[PDB]
Chains A and B, each alone.
Chain A
Amino acid sequence: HEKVTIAPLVLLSALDHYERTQTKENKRCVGVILGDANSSTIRVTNSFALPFEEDEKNSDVWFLDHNYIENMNEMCKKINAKEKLIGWYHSGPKLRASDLKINELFKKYTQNNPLLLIVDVKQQGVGLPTDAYVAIEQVKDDGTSTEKTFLHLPCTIEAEEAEEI
C-alpha cells in the first residue's frame, strides 16, 4: 500500500516563507520532497522550497526553475547522498489545474512515482486537510475522455526520535 508520511518540518519550513514574502490568498508555494523509497511506500522527510509565482486571473501562468533549484539538492547530496527526489509538493488552495496538464516535467527529475502534496497557508482545519495526489491514467465514466488525473491517498505526520520529544 502507498502511504505518504510527511515530516512536520515541511509545514514549518514553508510557514516561514509564507510570512517573509507574505504569500497567501490564492498564491501557491511550490516545493520538492526528499527521501529514499524503492517500494510503493513513500517516506517524506526533508523538503526544499521552489521560488514559484503565479497569476490569480490566469491559471496558465507558471514559472519553475529546473537545474537552478536543484543546486540545493546538489548541496544536500554532499550532506546526505542516500535520499533523492521522490516527488514534489504544492499549495493549491483552490487547486489550480496547471498540475493536470504537464505530469512529465516533474516526473523527469523524479524517478519515483508522481506524487503531489498540499500545503496550504492556512491548514487550520481540525480534520485532515493535507491531501496527496498520484497522477496516473484512470478510466472515467463521465463520458468525455480518459486522461491523467489525481489519485487521492491518505497521509499523516512523521514522528522520529529527533522531533518526537
Chain B
Amino acid sequence: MFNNHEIDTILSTLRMEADPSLHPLFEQFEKFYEEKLWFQLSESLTKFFDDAKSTPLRLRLYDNFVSKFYDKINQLSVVKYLLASLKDSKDFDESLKYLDDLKAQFQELDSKKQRNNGSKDHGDGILLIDSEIARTYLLKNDLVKARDLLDDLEKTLDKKDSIPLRITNSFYSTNSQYFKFKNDFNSFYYTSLLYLSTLEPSTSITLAERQQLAYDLSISALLGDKIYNFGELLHHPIMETIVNDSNYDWLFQLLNALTVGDFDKFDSLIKVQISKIPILAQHESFLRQKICLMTLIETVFVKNIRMLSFEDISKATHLPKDNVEHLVMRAISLGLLKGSIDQVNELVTISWVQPRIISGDQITKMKDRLVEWNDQVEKLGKKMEAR
C-alpha cells in the first residue's frame, strides 16, 4: 500500500528537502510495486522493520543509488539486506555480481573509512564476501572443494575482528551441512553448541530458527558424545516452544529412557527412518553403557570406595564382560576415567578426572566436610602458638 511512501517521506523530509537517493521517476515507484503493507525494499530506519517477502529481484534498483545515496543513510548500508534478502533466492549469477564483482577498494578506502561487517548499520561488504562464498557453494560443491572455502574463511576470522558473534552463525551453518554430509556427527554436535550461544543477539531472534535448530540438536546429541548424554537437553528447552512430534518427540522419551535403560523404551526412540544409518547401531550401545556408568560412578563414590567390580557394570548394560572391558576404553579415551581395569582380580580401578557438573545435592555434605574436618586442623594447631 502507501506505507512505503508515507513513512519514508517523513524521515527523508526532516533530513533532505528533496530525496537525494530516490530519483523523481523512482519516487512514485516506491508505493507502486506490491499491494502489501511492507514491500521488498526500504531505506534508513524504515528498512529495519522491512525484510524479504518472496523473490526480491528489485534490489538492482536499490543498488542503482550510489552518488547521492549517502545523503540519507550512510553509503555502507547498501549491503545490509542486499545479500540477506537473497538468501532464499539461490542464484549463482546474482551472487557473483555482489561477491566477485564487488571486489575491494571501491570508493571506501579513499574518502571514507571501513568498518567491514556490512549486514548491520553501515559497513563495507568485503568481509561479507568471504562469509557468503561458503553458503552459495554449500549445495554446489562436495566435501573436496568445501575445505578450500574454509581456509580463506577461518584464517580471515583470526585476521580481523567483529563485535557481533553472528559471523560465527554463518560459519556454523556452513559446517552444519558440511558435517551433515559426513558420517561422524561428533564434530556436528560441538558446532551446534556455540551456535546456540550466539542466538541471543540480533539477526533473526525469531522462533523460525529454533524449529530447524531443534532438528539439529536432536540428531547431534543422539550420535554425538561430549558431556553426559541427555544433560544438555534440559539446559535450553527451546524445543518445547516448537512442534512436539516429527522427530522432535524422540528427545521426550530419550530423557527418561537413559535414566531407566530399558529396551522397551528404545523401540519408541528409534524408528525405521533413523535405523537406515549404520552409525546408529554403534552409538545405540554407547549411550546406554555410558549413562549406566555415570550412575555407577556416582554410586561407587561415597567416602573411601574408588573401585568397582564386574558385577554391577555388566548387569546394567546387559553385555558380556569380555566386550565391556574394551567398550569402556572407547569412552576412556574421551577423558572420563584414567583408571586401569584388571582381569584376574575382577576389580575395576578408577582414576576419576571427570568434572561431573550439575551439583547441589552434594554441596550440603560436600562443603561442610571442607570446614568441620578442616576445623580439626585448626583445633590441633592452637598448641603450636608457643612460638
Contact = CB atoms under 8 A, between A and B. Distances in A.
Interface of A: 141, 143-145
A145 B165 contact: yes
B235 A143 contact: yes
Nearest to A143: B235
Contacts of A141: 355
Contacts of B165: 145
A144 B197 CA distance: 6
A141 B197 CA distance: 12
Contacts of B355: 141
A143 B197 CA distance: 8
A145 B195 CA distance: 11
Interface residues of B, number: 4
A143 B235 CA distance: 9
Nearest to B197: A145
Nearest to B165: A145
A144 B200 CA distance: 10
Contacts of A144: 197
Interface string B150-189: 0000000000000001000000000000000000000000
6 contacts: A141-B355, A143-B197, A143-B235, A144-B197, A145-B165, A145-B197
A141 B190 CA distance: 13
Interface in B348-384: 355
Interface of B: 165, 197, 235, 355
A42 B75 CA distance: 46
Contacts of A145: 165, 197
Contacts of B235: 143
A143 B228 CA distance: 14
A141 B235 CA distance: 13
A143 B231 CA distance: 13
A80 B197 CA distance: 49
Nearest to A147: B165
A137 to B, nearest CB: 11
A141 B165 CA distance: 18
A141 B355 CA distance: 11
A145 B163 CA distance: 13
A146 B165 CA distance: 10
Q: Which of A141, A143, A144 has the most CB of B within 10 A?
A: A143
A112 to B, nearest CB: 20
Nearest to A144: B197
A72 B49 CA distance: 51
Nearest to B236: A143
A144 B235 CA distance: 11
B219 to A, nearest CB: 20
Contacts of A143: 197, 235
Ranked nearest first, the 5 interchain pairs of A and B with the lowest CB-CB distance are: A145-B197, A144-B197, A143-B235, A143-B197, A145-B165
Nearest to B200: A145
Nearest to B357: A141
A142 B165 CA distance: 18
Nearest to B227: A141
B168 to A, nearest CB: 11
A10 to B, nearest CB: 33
A135 B235 CA distance: 29
A134 B235 CA distance: 31
A163 to B, nearest CB: 30
A144 B236 CA distance: 11
A144 B355 CA distance: 18
Contacts of B197: 143-145
A144 B165 CA distance: 13
A102 to B, nearest CB: 12
A160 B355 CA distance: 45
Nearest to B193: A143
A119 to B, nearest CB: 31
B221 to A, nearest CB: 14
A140 to B, nearest CB: 10
A114 to B, nearest CB: 16
A162 B355 CA distance: 50
A145 B165 CA distance: 10
A6 to B, nearest CB: 31
B283 to A, nearest CB: 23
Nearest to B232: A143
A165 B257 CA distance: 73
A36 B235 CA distance: 48
A111 to B, nearest CB: 19
A144 B201 CA distance: 13
B375 to A, nearest CB: 19
B146 to A, nearest CB: 25
B197 to A, nearest CB: 6
B164 to A, nearest CB: 12
B227 to A, nearest CB: 9
